[PDB]
């Protein structure tokens, strides 16, 4: 996350870190059930001789705050047993960029490990709404991934403006969240993590999934996220959540 700040300990208990063998943190995910994580499909495409599409090559860390303290009380380490990328994921356009990850062994709820609620198909997060991206991704373009989990307050942008800022690249599955003055944005290695909508009432829904951007934190180029509501029935159907 660019232009964000340190999360407070245990403030985002659904945020997960996905480590690939030999690489440390690579992608984000979201705890939705004791057995299931929601992440971005494009994180599990074989690349550079490494088989990212292969569950066995991944470790998931839950209740993690600080990448240099993975043995902290609260952290739960879980192997994956399955990866289910959306069948319409297109790695050329990034359309339908969502995936479900099955844990080998169930997460255990705690002060540091708690699930986030899924939105109904009908759920709407209107233009101008202040929401949240979290992650351990780079803190600048071409920079270094945060050790402490980062949070960024960003605002929904309307789909007409979105399509205009990113012509020929925005599909109905996508939403722009951010600012036109850039500055605060998702970046590399935030992908697959939660876009979190925190309501004034205390309820917390997952608006979307970190997908892509044209660079990070650039003027007129806000991050693009997969819209979660569209996938409710696809999630119920394949996971049972």
């Amino acid at each position, epitope marked *: 996350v660019v232009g964000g700040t340190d999360a407070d300990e245990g403030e985002w208990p659904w945020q997960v870190s996905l480590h690939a063998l030999g690489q440390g943190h690579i992608c984000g995910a979201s705890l939705i059930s004791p057995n299931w994580l929601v992440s971005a499909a*494009h994180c599990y*495409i*074989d*690349d*550079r*001789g490494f088989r990212y599409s292969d569950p066995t090559q991944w470790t998931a860390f839950l209740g993690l705050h600080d990448q240099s303290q993975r043995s902290a009380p609260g952290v739960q380490e879980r192997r994956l047993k399955r990866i289910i990328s959306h069948p319409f*994921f*297109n*790695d*050329f*356009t*990034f359309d339908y960029d969502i995936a479900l990850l099955e844990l080998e062994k169930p997460a255990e709820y705690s002060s540091m490990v708690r699930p986030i609620s899924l939105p109904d198909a009908s759920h709407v997060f209107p233009a101008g709404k202040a929401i949240w991206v979290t992650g351990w991704g*780079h803190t600048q*373009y*071409g920079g270094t991934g945060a050790l402490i989990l980062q949070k960024g307050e960003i605002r929904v942008i309307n789909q007409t403006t979105c399509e205009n800022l990113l*012509p*020929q*690249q925005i599909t109905p599955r996508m939403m722009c969240v951010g600012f036109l003055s850039g500055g605060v944005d998702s*970046c*590399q290695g935030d*992908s697959g993590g939660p876009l979190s909508s925190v309501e004034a009432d205390g309820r917390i829904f997952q608006a979307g999934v970190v997908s*892509w*951007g*044209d*660079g*990070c934190a650039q003027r007129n180029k806000p991050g693009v996220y997969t819209r979660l509501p569209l996938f409710r029935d696809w999630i119920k159907e394949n996971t049972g959540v």
Partner: antibody
Framework: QVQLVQSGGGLVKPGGSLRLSCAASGFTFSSYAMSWVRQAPGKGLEWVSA????????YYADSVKGRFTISRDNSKNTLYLQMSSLRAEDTAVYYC?????????????????????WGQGTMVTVSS | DIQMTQSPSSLSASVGDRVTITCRASQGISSYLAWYQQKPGKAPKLLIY???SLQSGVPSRFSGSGSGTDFTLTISSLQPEDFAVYYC?????????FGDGTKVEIKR
């Protein structure tokens, strides 16, 4: 340095078939969608086909849809194009080409790019 | 299917001259317009992307401007090695479509 070394080509009778090759080196091949672009003798440039980095998604220009097949082997760092049902109008030089990425240090879709590196070209002559 | 149209079809200019070529798209393309340089027997070479951005290692006398449907490549000061066919390409939609080409010959 980034290189795209092509091979293949030649003379093929109409209706016949051919496989063009592009061997890539100097960058992470698998991270890059690729295209084949052609140029008829004395004529302009025509985009022919494209493939995402994974091999998952493929596109073709109309004049060539159904007759051609673009594919890739990321373990050999090579791009392929199978041409079939070859007509006279397919006679041309075929280049392979890599997309120009504006911000390569974050991953994203590659559908809006012109082409920064090109192979040397492969002449294909269709004739009886 | 976007049609790209180039003017003039060919031209002749003197070393040191300013040269200006025009490209026209049949529908708007935002800024997704590129300019290539093709020398005989060689592959096209990327000069300009996104209408006005100069590829690195490309000489400073090459420059582009424009938006939507209407684009210009300028060579501020023509050099002999600038002999070539110059192509515009739209880089927005599939099929990516090239202009028909502007042949620049040197006048000597």
């Amino acid at each position: 340095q980034v290189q795209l070394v092509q091979s293949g080509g030649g003379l093929v009778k109409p209706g016949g078939s051919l496989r063009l090759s592009c061997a890539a080196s100097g960058f992470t091949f698998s991270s890059y969608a690729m295209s084949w672009v052609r140029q008829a003798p004395g004529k302009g440039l025509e985009w022919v086909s494209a493939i995402s980095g994974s091999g998952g998604s493929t596109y073709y220009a109309d004049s060539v849809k159904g007759r051609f097949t673009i594919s890739r082997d990321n373990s050999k760092n090579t791009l392929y194009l199978q041409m079939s049902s070859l007509r006279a109008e397919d006679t041309a030089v075929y280049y392979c080409a890599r997309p120009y990425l504006t911000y390569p240090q974050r991953r994203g879709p590659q559908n809006v790019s012109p082409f920064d590196n090109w192979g040397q070209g492969t002449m294909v002559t269709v004739s009886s | 299917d976007i049609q790209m149209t180039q003017s003039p079809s060919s031209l002749s200019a003197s070393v040191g001259d300013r040269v200006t070529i025009t490209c026209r798209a049949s529908q708007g393309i935002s800024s997704y317009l590129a300019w290539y340089q093709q020398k005989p027997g060689k592959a096209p070479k990327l000069l300009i992307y996104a209408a006005s951005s100069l590829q690195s290692g490309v000489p400073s006398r090459f420059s582009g401007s424009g938006s939507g449907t209407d684009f210009t490549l300028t060579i501020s000061s023509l050099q002999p090695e600038d002999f070539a066919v110059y192509y515009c390409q739209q880089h927005g939609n599939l099929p990516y479509t090239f202009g028909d080409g502007t042949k620049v010959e040197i006048k000597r």
